[PDB]
Design a protein around this ligand. Sequence first.
Ligand SMILES: N=C(N)c1ccc(OCCCCCOc2ccc(C(=N)N)cc2)cc1
Lengths: 248, 248, 248
Amino acid sequence: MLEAQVQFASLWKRLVECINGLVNEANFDCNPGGLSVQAMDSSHVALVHMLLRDDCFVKYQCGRNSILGLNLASLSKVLKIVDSNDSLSLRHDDDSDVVTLTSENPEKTRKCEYQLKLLEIEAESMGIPEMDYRSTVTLNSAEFAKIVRDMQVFGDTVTIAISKEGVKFSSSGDVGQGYTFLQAAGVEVTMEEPITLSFALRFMGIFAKGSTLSERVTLKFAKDSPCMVEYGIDNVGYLRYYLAPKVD
Amino acid sequence: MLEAQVQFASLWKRLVECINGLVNEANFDCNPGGLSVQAMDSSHVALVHMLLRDDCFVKYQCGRNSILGLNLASLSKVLKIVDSNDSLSLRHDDDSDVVTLTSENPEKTRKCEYQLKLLEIEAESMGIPEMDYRSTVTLNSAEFAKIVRDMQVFGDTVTIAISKEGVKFSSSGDVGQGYTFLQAAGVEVTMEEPITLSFALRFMGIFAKGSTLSERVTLKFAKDSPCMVEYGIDNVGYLRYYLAPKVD
Amino acid sequence: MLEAQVQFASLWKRLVECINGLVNEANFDCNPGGLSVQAMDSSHVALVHMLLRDDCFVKYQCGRNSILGLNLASLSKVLKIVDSNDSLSLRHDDDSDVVTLTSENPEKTRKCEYQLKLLEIEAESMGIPEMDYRSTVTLNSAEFAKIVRDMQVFGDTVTIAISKEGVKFSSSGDVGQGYTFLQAAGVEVTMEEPITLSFALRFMGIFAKGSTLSERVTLKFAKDSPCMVEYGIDNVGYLRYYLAPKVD
Ligand SMILES: N=C(N)c1ccc(OCCCCCOc2ccc(C(=N)N)cc2)cc1
């Protein structure tokens, strides 16, 4: 038996949208100590790790690890119809091919239950990059999102430059060339070396949807190494993305 | 001859929008009692009956029964460009071939007038499915619309089950299966007996636009009988839908 | 060689949208009196003339008249991603083959800079029409914009009839006939004679977007003559459109 109730469905809604943007199916590693989702785009260029610790749920009951694989396409379609202010309980009875989502009015006047079928999803082949990040920049989630959208009016790749002075996002295409410089503090830059890597704006966009979860976003970079985009879900979880640098 | 001035065009705007979306053309039964529209889908599964009693208009003048046929498509377009807070005088003259919608601002500083050509539409073979309903449910028009839209993510058929306890809406499909139960009281139920019938969501959605006209909606049900979705237009008229169940 | 900064980019964002509506490339006559675009549509029936005077900018510098060709398409695509309340400094150095738009935060914490390639625009046949205007209707900018959107539901040609009582905009088509009458007083008419011209609505629509720059619009008319449609920019310049009568 499994049960995770959240006070506000908004979290699940704002979460699945962030993930469905990268992959359309994923396995929910529901183990005691929290609910984890790990997955890679078909390009094998970009990975999402999502942890929700057990302190995140008003009710959480996972005695033994049970992996549940799920169609994010369907799940997303169901969550769209669930009022955010309503409660949401995700429940699985052992040896079921379906998992149950239950929502209730704060008033208890209305109850909605939605049953979705489970899938068989093979375990992610690749795993979190084992890297120590030299340069770390933190900035307002929404500003990050705007910048990617903006840089995309120019090209499909963004050249991020970390410097003591601040980060410079730059891009070029037919429309022409542009850049956005963010003066460091507010932009909290931590640097050991002046690092400057380039990344695919398509994925950066997918990531930026994290603005729905956290007011600020931590971007961690390492020379000739994947990047991490971390979104903190309060101190009750996190959403982390990893993307490959563009190389010549 | 005919003259039907309403103080606020909002009504006509909302009504035509509702009636359109089941039918493209309709005859306006201009009787000295009021205006009436009776019509049926191409599928001939769904009927719409609308009554606007003379009390609804600030100036009704229909000495004799005139049947005016109109393209709801063309009417909807002309109405979309009319401020709802403006007057709307519908008018026809002997053998005019055209109807005249006239609109004025409260300040009488702006006058808009539009002329639409009448169509010849044959009378409706089917008649109001006059019947007595065992069970009668009233709820918030808006919640109804939400429920129909929500159930439409699962399937195209809705199963309504009426119990002293309350009303549950069930739908199934590839996405999976979901249900929304409403606890009886503002859910006002009224069952001389328990009943559970299934309907097409497509036509339910067409009806659910009645919310723009009324904050509550009354649903009447009889076994192996068309249902009725009623929306009261103040005390000046009503909009009624009747739809054939699905039985196996 | 040229620098022109404005406090709020709102103007540029609102201006380019207006003039990108009519033409995709335009030359900017930069000179010490200010910036000036004068362009015709390809059909040669419509002419836009825009003047921003030096006092429009918080900082203007143009010793020598240079002509700059810009792709209003690209310029549009850039200004879309510039915050209204950020400042915008348009600059050009001797034989640079690009202009630089530079965007500063009020708080100076963010700097965006974009470079657009300059075009060689050959069209300069534009000759401001003589202005012996007899009639001068002036009305709310957004009402004129609505009237044209509305008249488009009927036809693609509008007939403006100016009389002592007020102005009538008439249109006809498959949907039917329509007209909006605005009585004089805030409609301010000024005629020497009853005048009635007809005009293409496609262009009147392009012009109407001027409502973003001015709370009021001025239409000037003369028999057999192009009308003028003038949007005042705050006494620091203008946006004027001229359109050939369709009575030809
Ligand atoms: N460079 C010059 N000295 C010059 C050359 C031509 C010109 O033209 C005057 C009449 C026509 C241009 C005034 O605006 C239009 C445009 C198109 C039509 C049409 N084709 N219906 C009607 C009126 C004015 C000045």
